[PDB]
Amino acid sequence: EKFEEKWNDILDLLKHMVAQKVKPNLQTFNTILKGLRKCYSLGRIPALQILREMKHIGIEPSLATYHHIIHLFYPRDLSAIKMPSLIIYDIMNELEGRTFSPQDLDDGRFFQLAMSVCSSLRDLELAYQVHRLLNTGDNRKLVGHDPLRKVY
């Protein structure tokens, strides 16, 4: 019923992960962010904090981890198109030239979602950056499956 209680509960599981000397993995953070996509409005500040904590621990954000942050910051059913967020530009700068490997089950989703946000923003320069990232190394393998390859 209450998000604040719900969030404090999920955090309690994380606190018991340190009491029992259990270290988190990529999936642990990806799971929390995938859950946060329900509360688009209130999950923005929590979502950024997780990614900062991911780097400090030493877990490397994968394409799936950004796929969730994008969904949370650029809603498809977004009425407020007047002043969209600028995070997508920073993410692409962060991932410029990097090569990625399969490390989660939502890695394919990232590329299809990134182009959609570009079409919504009508920024063709960003679309070239996203496509340029797809061509580096063997990133082409994470474009998506039959449903998402033709959408991208």
Q: Which residues in this chain contact another protein in the complex, by CB under 8 A?
A: 11, 14-15, 17-18, 23-24, 48-53, 55-58, 85-87, 90-91, 94, 97, 99, 101-105, 107-108, 131-132, 135-138, 140-143
* CB-count burial class (<10 Å; 0-12, 13-18, 19+) for 48: middle
CB 132 within 8 A of CB 93: no
Minimum separation from the CB atom of position 104 to another protein (A): 7
- Closer residue to another protein, CB minimum distance, 38 or 137: 137
- Closest of 81, 22, 73 to residue 51, by C-alpha: 73
| 7/116 with CB nearer another protein | 7
Cβ at position 7, least distance to another protein in Å: 11
Helices and strands, counts by H and E, the chain: 8, 0
Residue among 1 and 19 whose Cβ is closer to another protein: 19
- Least spacing, CB of residue 76 vs another protein, in Å: 20
Which amino acid, 103?
Q
To another protein, the closest distance from the beta carbon of 3 in angstroms equals 16
**Main-chain phi, psi angles of 33, to 5 degrees:** -70, -40
Nearer Cβ to another protein (119/128): 128
Query: Which 8-state DSSP code applies to residue 104?
Result: S
The encoded tokens of residue 46 equal 């929590």
